[PDB]
Amino acid sequence: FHVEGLIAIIVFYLLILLVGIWAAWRRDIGLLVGGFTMTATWVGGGYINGTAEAVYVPGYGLAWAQAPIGYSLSLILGGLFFAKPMRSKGYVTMLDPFQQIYGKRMGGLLFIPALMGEMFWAAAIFSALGATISVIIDVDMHISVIISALIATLYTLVGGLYTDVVQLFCIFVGLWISVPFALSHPAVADIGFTAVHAKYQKPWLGTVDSSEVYSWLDSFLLLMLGGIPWQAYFQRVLSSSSATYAQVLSFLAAFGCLVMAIPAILIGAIGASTDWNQTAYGLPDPKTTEEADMILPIVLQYLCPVYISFFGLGAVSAAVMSSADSSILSASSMFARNIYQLSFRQNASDKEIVWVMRITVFVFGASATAMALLTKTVYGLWYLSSDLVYIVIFPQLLCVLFVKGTNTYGAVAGYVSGLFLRITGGEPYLYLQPLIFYPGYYPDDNGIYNQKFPFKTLAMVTSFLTNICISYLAKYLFESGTLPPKLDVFDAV
Ligand SMILES: *[C@@H]1O[C@H](CO)[C@@H](O[C@@H]2O[C@H](CO)[C@@H](O[C@@H]3O[C@H](CO)[C@@H](O)[C@H](O)[C@@H]3O)[C@H](O)[C@H]2NC(C)=O)[C@H](O)[C@H]1NC(C)=O
Numbered sequence: 001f002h003v004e005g006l007i008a009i010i011v012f013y014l015l016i017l018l019v020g021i022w023a024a025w026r027r028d029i030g031l032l033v034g035g036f037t038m039t040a041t042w043v044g045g046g047y048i049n050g051t052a053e054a055v056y057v058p059g060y061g062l063a064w065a066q067a068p069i070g071y072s073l074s075l076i077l078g079g080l081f082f083a084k085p086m087r088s089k090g091y092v093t094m095l096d097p098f099q100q101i102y103g104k105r106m107g108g109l110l111f112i113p114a115l116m117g118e119m120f121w122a123a124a125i126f127s128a129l130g131a132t133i134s135v136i137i138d139v140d141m142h143i144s145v146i147i148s149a150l151i152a153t154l155y156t157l158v159g160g161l162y163t164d165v166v167q168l169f170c171i172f173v174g175l176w177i178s179v180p181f182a183l184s185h186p187a188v189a190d191i192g193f194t195a196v197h198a199k200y201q202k203p204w205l206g207t208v209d210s211s212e213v214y215s216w217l218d219s220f221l222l223l224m225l226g227g228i229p230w231q232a233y234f235q236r237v238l239s240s241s242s243a244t245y246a247q248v249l250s251f252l253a254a255f256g257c258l259v260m261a262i263p264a265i266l267i268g269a270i271g272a273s274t275d276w277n278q279t280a281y282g283l284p285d286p287k288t289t290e291e292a293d294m295i296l297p298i299v300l301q302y303l304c305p306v307y308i309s310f311f312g313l314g315a316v317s318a319a320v321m322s323s324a325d326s327s328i329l330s331a332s333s334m335f336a337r338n339i340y341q342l343s344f345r346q347n348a349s350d351k352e353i354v355w356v357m358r359i360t361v362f363v364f365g366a367s368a369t370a371m372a373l374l375t376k377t378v379y380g381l382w383y384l385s386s387d388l389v390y391i392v393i394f395p396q397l398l399c400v401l402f403v404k405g406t407n408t409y410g411a412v413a414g415y416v417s418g419l420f421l422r423i424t425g426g427e428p429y430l431y432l433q434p435l436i437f438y439p440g441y442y443p444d445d446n447g448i449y450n451q452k453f454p455f456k457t458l459a460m461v462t463s464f465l466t467n468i469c470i471s472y473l474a475k476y477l478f479e480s481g482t483l484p485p486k487l488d489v490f491d492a493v
């Protein structure tokens with residue numbers, strides 16, 4: 001087990017690194033490579049393992065696999081709406097507009113939650129990589145994720161002293177070659193039948209009841225409008241040369257990620273349609289055994305022959321471990337540059353960049369490892385990433401950019417209001433019992449209250465209206481008498 005798995009992973013990762021450095025070593029297609037790399041930024045660890053877990057779990061089903069359909073629509077909306085009002089004014093990055101208007105220091109306050117979201121995303125990628133490595137070499141869960149994160153961070157440290165194209169071909173081959181003949185054991189039932197009638201378990205095409213349609217709408221408008229303000233997307237859009245180039249790139253990336261989500265949904269459907277008693281996985285199912293994150297690696301390993309399995313599985317592991325470096329490097333470099341050019345100053349010649357980036361990558365590897373080492377989900381961390389980005393970035397990025405009005409006062413007021421209406425609202429994925437108990441609450445199996453009434457969307461709306469109202473009242477009273485203009489720290493007058 002151990003030796004063959006290590007051989008496969010080492011061989012395939014060495015090959016992909018050689019191919020990448022060779023392509024870097026030395027027309028009518030240019031958009032397609034850009035589309036592939038931009039959809040390579042989203043895919044990797046997030047979709048495949050995450051959406052496999054979302055489909056497989058009895059209770060979620062496909063109807064609650066909110067992410068893969070959420071983020072393609074996120075790209076479409078972001079391109080079609082924000083692609084135009086991002087060129088004429090002139091924006092180096094998405095961090096620049098916040099520092100341009102809200103004095104400059106408030107950018108760090110606004111990008112501590114985006115940093116937290118990217119921490120969550122890195123934790124999801126690390127958990128996916130740990131799951132795949134643990135399945136392929138059969139050593140353990142907690143050790144595997146720590147080792148994988150250590151390798152990823154060490155590779156980040158010296159990896160800077162085109163790859164993304166080969167990375168997606170690795171995923172596309174690895175999955176689509178392993179499930180034209182995977183649903184062929186005497187165990188796997190008809191993928192069409194277990195969608196609507198339930199052989200081994202409750203149907204993988206999950207059902208949403210009329211009582212909790214509001215939760216669906218909220219948790220789907222969350223993903224749609226929280227996948228847009230991410231740093232990687234706006235870093236790729238602004239470097240695009242032509243105006244319509246950004247729109248075309250976003251549309252092709254959305255189509256690519258929709259096509260890429262197909263091989264992973266069927267994997268979850270197979271996993272939910274098997275008979276985990278005639279295979280080699282023993283009597284317990286991966287549902288009454290908290291290993292629902294490994295559904296995709298388990299179906300790839302056990303429901304495929306020896307030679308077909310490890311090719312695709314090693315390809316998937318290599319692709320996700322490749323994406324880990326991009327995640328960590330962005331999450332460290334953006335923080336270092338923005339906030340240590342924000343706070344006072346630091347000598348950027350030979351000290352600031354080197355040691356602050358080094359300490360940042362070390363601490364972020366440690367934090368992502370600790371964050372993904374305890375939460376036994378791979379979809380939950382990803383969802384919470386998009387969640388917090390939605391709550392406390394999208395309203396302010398929408399009011400600063402789309403039309404007009406946002407002062408600094410409204411920024412802090414909306415920040416406080418949104419954070420309050422969430423942290424008092426309740427986070428079921430973590431062990432955070434709510435404190436307001438919005439009408440329609442139903443207790444969960446664990447013992448953690450979750451709410452049917454929407455409070456993420458309510459938090460977004462409250463933050464936006466708080467920003468607008470506070471800023472316009474500031475424009476009302478910028479004169480004397482009512483709060484004389486002497487008080488001025490961050491100015492709107
Ligand atoms: C998969 O599950 C099936 C049952 O759904 C298992 O098949 C049955 O397993 C039992 C226990 O090993 C075999 O012994 C039988 O036990 C009952 C208990 O009262 C006894 O009354 C019978 O006289 C018999 O001794 C049983 O023969 C077997 N049935 C068949 C048709 O093979 C099976 O072991 C599970 N695992 C697989 C298929 O890998």
Ligand SMILES: C[N+](C)(C)CCO
Binds near residue numbers: 227
């Ligand atoms: C929505 N995110 C950008 C956080 C991940 C896409 O997989």
